[PDB]
């Protein structure tokens with residue numbers, strides 16, 4: 285079956301693990317307390333794309349920070365590392381003007397929940413089918 289199983293036991297706060305799945309990168313960021321608070325400080329009315337783009341929940345869900353992470357605590361942000369403009373790999377480590385990712389191909393800026401805030405990309409980075417299957421492992425697909 286297509287599903288893969290990622291050991292995240294050694295991922296510390298502020299670290300992103302990048303794994304390849306279905307030929308493309310998936311970003312697994314263990315968010316810092318600043319990342320989480322800032323994501324939770326954005327009003328839906330400020331977003332370019334108000335849809336959560338999240339395979340795990342209703343397709344009409346709002347892009348609240350809570351609807352962008354796997355866990356209620358907001359530490360685990362799992363998303364396709366595929367810019368929604370033309371598919372370049374966004375650069376992380378708190379890059380761009382919104383404390384998230386910056387796609388250098390045509391200048392798209394994503395926030396700390398991977399939501400599009402500036403530039404040509406039309407959508408928030410999509411979230412794959414993903415869930416913890418115990419304390420240390422995320423199943424993708």
Ligand code: FES
Pocket residue numbers: 367368369370371372387388389390391392403404405
């Ligand atoms: S591919 Fe990311 S801004 Fe164009």
